[PDB]
Symmetry: C3
Subunit: 286 residues, 3 copies
């Protein structure tokens, strides 16, 4: 049986994706999650929603308790996490109103709790060195992309399509994010450096969320919402564009939950769990 957790970012502080059946006010061994967890169903598929920043968007990116959010969803029996992440574009073909189903990242965060494990008494016992070459659940990424196709949203894959298929607004079928600490936005100098490294978007919340999801044995995928060009490059139209983006992502998320529930995930879930065990350095040395 699957159960899909949803971590909603900017624009999803108070989602209302389904009829609320129950609420869970919980804590974890790592502290309090960002807010109450909301339980319900998309069709016959159990779903749990949590706003990354809390209902009033009072928690900044560096202070989000990523460990508690991921562990709370694990404790409720989630098998998957779908996340939204607002971002700035570093590249001309990613324009405000587009989305990116990320497959890669470069980490420039610091000072955040980014692992459940360690040698101190307040972390889980053991040492975990997780492979992160392709850090998302690929099967779940392809679900997000197919959900966009099913909801009549353009999909652009630069590996197989010419630039003529980059029709806006579109879901970019791959992409890399730099995660910065915030809360300040980047300088023009930083933006040009990240662009020169070949990164596609900049955001403040993907890491360590994606890392902790893999440590928890959960299938994780992010859909990033391009809200503007970062500073390497009217306001009423911007806010309206973001509103329309949120409507489209809500459509993608609900279709994605249905598509996840339509398939069997037994082997993928067992492989998620086995990857955690095989990454326990303290167990493999003995």
């Amino acid at each position: 049986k699957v159960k899909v957790g949803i971590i909603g970012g900017s624009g999803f502080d108070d989602p209302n994706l389904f009829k609320k059946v129950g609420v869970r006010q919980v804590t974890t061994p790592f502290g309090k999650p960002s807010d109450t967890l909301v339980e319900g169903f998309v069709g016959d598929v159990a779903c749990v929603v949590l706003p990354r920043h809390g209902k009033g968007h009072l928690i900044p990116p560096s202070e989000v308790n990523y460990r508690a959010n991921v562990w709370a969803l694990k404790d409720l029996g989630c098998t998957h996490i779908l996340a939204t992440n607002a971002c700035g574009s570093l590249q001309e073909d990613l324009v405000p109103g587009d989305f990116v189903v990320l497959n890669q990242f470069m980490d420039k965060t610091w000072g955040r709790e980014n692992t459940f494990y360690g040698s101190k008494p307040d972390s889980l016992k053991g040492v975990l060195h997780m492979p992160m070459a392709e850090p998302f659940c690929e099967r779940t990424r392809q679900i997000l992309i197919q959900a966009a196709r099913n909801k009549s949203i353009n999909v652009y894959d630069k590996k197989t399509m010419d630039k003529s298929a980059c029709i806006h607004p579109c879901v970019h079928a791959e992409g890399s994010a730099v995660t910065i600490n915030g809360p300040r936005f980047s300088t023009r100098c930083e933006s040009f450096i990240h662009k020169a490294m070949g990164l596609d978007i900049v955001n403040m919340t993907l890491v360590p969320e994606v890392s902790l999801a893999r440590e928890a044995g959960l299938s994780y995928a992010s859909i990033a919402i391009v809200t503007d060009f970062d500073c390497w490059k009217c306001v009423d139209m911007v806010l309206e564009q973001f509103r329309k983006s949120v409507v489209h992502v809500r459509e993608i998320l609900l279709e994605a939950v249905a598509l996840i529930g339509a398939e069997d995930w037994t082997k993928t879930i067992e492989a998620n769990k086995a990857l955690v065990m095989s990454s326990r350095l303290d167990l493999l040395h003995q």
Copy 2:
């Protein structure tokens, strides 16, 4: 109504820029500043001076309470902050004894309190996401540059002058800093990587000071003092640098007092309010 704060770095642990009127021992919601704050007048312009590292320079760059220093200057009524920052050059044209009126940076610091706002009880309530594309106050940058001209110090502007006009010692009219955490200096490998990224100087103290000044609604500009080439490639030179940076600061204070800042001060304050995402 303007009042100019001055944060003195290396070579400015005990500046004595003017006859002291008062000495302020203050606290802030973020702790105590690096030292007492000295207040007085330069001409008719009110001025406040604070040594970044304290009188004895006993506080290393990663342990400076940037939040307390900036907040204390704001509390005493400062509208502007002028800061000095010692640095190493990453570029052939920036030689020891030159100064740089910075306009950009790349941040490699960690573990420092870099914002006044958050969700924890030790910060002001709110989520503040400040634009930083051009992170300095441009009017105040141009004041530093005009102050150097008024004191007959060479200015080199790469966008409008040939390289043959780069006559040393000179004030470079623009430049980018990488801020590293310290206390160690860079390796040759790190210096070459920073150079290849296009950065001009390396220093340990610019960030988060520049960021917190904008959060506090203040106009901030830095003058960096090139002390040596960084290791991709002195005391007597630095003493002469301090003498001329002092002249620049004192002239810059006079020049700030010579204009109206009403709309810039208003814009500084409104930018903070418009950057509050929780509101």
Copy 3:
């Protein structure tokens, strides 16, 4: 008189005894093994403790280095498992590093400061060439003496690279861990020109210089990180399997290096190490 400490990586003589020490900065990773190589006193310290329970970001580098300083060590030889970012550095090779790029954070990386849990002072140490060059060349000559190939990219051709070899120079990026790198990070580090990626070199190398000690690292290439094919992407089992095979050569190099160190006069080098610390004391 010289005395060589050895800080041992993942899978880590005439043993006299085992010693527990305390330090102003806490307890070292584990007890220390005291002995001799010939007539040269030697002390061995595992970086991660006996059960390998301490991850790289939580190793007490300050206590490990200071413990060896307090026992009278003049030299530290260190091993560090790593991933290769470059075609000619292959699993089973070794690198006598001469450079690094630091991406660690949150680790205690200096003995000095203004907080009560550090020594009083402000120490700004030069780090242009952050290793002891004399000791680096001892590690390379030790490999020659044990019939292990040495590859110098300054003087030799890729066609003349014979494996397993000790690479006579190289640069490391140190990441904080515990996770391995993404493919995107791996390619960015490769494009910066870095040779290997590891998690334990920094701040160990920096603190050794703060302590006035001669320090050199021999990195053990266990994998190609993750910039190559999917079957070559790093994981714990891959690191451990190659490490177990390479430690035999690393032991031979280290034991020979200790003998070579004890056969030379180090009076002025040691004086220079200490004088570098004193001249970096800005508060004085």
